[PDB]
Amino acid sequence: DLPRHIAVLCDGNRRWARSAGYDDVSYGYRMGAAKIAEMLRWCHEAGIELATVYLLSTENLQRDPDELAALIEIITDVVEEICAPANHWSVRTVGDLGLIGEEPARRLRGAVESTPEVASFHVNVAVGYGGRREIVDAVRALLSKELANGATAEELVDAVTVEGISENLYTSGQPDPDLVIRTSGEQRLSGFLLWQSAYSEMWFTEAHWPAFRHVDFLRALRDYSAR
Amino acid sequence: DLPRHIAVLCDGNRRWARSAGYDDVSYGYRMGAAKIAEMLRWCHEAGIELATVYLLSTENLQRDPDELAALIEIITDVVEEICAPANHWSVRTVGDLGLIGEEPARRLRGAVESTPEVASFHVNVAVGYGGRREIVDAVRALLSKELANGATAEELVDAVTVEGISENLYTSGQPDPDLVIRTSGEQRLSGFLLWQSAYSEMWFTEAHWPAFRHVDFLRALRDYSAR
């Protein structure tokens, strides 16, 4: 009836800001950041075991340097809030912090490392992430390990398995997402948790992410249960 | 405007039959088969370049033997019709025919091989298909080619790339799906063209597959164009 793992693509932040009459789209990102905090609280309280939030795609990283820097600061603030010790949430980065700049990477890593490995609620923060890239990096990790274990070249050709890839993703050892929520009426896909979401329920709302409400979350859960 | 590649998950054949008071739900598959042929005609006439139709997943192959026997025969008929010389359609099998039995596999392969390599309309028939397995088999093919070209084990560990995977999938040489059509109100992913559909537009109808009509196809194209 209830998802174990909900994944959320937080779309529409800039559109939201423009609709509200703001010239600076960071107003959108800041409100989206507030909604991320809300959503994770809802998930925890509803008994969801794991939530993954899509904070920064590799696509996002191609944008105006100044705007991007501001966004990355908002994201780092978000993660630091997620990692607050009063929450007692276990947190994991999903993606490549090598892409966000070293000072933000240090701050993010520091926050995430401060969280317990064992907790009732787990949060994945997807930063500097792409789904196809993740699979490639999983394969490379898999093969690297096999080589270290004395695999021959011809053994490396046969070493790759579905289970071997799964075990080498960022999400190694976690249940796959049961429910993937996307906002802004986007029914495209965008490769978020590409491998892991192969059998996930998709749920869509027209509302932009900063406008996402607790009752929208309730509808998502109700729709999921009904399916 | 127009999708280059439409992918169709023909869900709801059994449910349609059950809903319409049919004791034998194989009948749903037969109605669904007729609809596949019509859909492909609509695609061709509308100027879509490539259509992929999901006929048999690796899951589907664990049904009741009487039902599975009927389904496999019906799928074989569907493919034989798609491959009819009068269509002049170029057809490709997407999946592992080793999973459907020797005699059906023989018939399917014969039909598909009889079709032209060059044609204005192309149809992928997905039979014995699993998306995660496809990626694994692509990676294995990739590495095998590297080994054949003289790569060392050391070099193999780092040989895998996003483009390398795409080039070694069943759909090598083809555009990824632009539009994925799902019926029966299903919004649950099924690993169908998993890698390829990372960025595809998803479109949903409540109509069960055997109830799918040209007006619904037109709606999908309109909705696609408007997105």
Ligand SMILES: CC(C)=CCC/C(C)=C/COP(=O)(O)OP(=O)(O)O
């Ligand atoms: C000849 C055809 C149409 C082949 C397609 C087979 C595939 C779509 C699954 C058939 O079962 P189902 O999943 O459609 O039944 P249901 O979804 O109602 O359980």
Ligand SMILES: CC(C)=CCC/C(C)=C\COP(=O)(O)OP(=O)(O)O
């Ligand atoms: C703190 C938050 C919510 C971070 C998410 C940042 C990123 C994933 C959104 C990019 O802009 P956008 O895609 O949301 O703008 P729009 O979709 O309107 O173009």
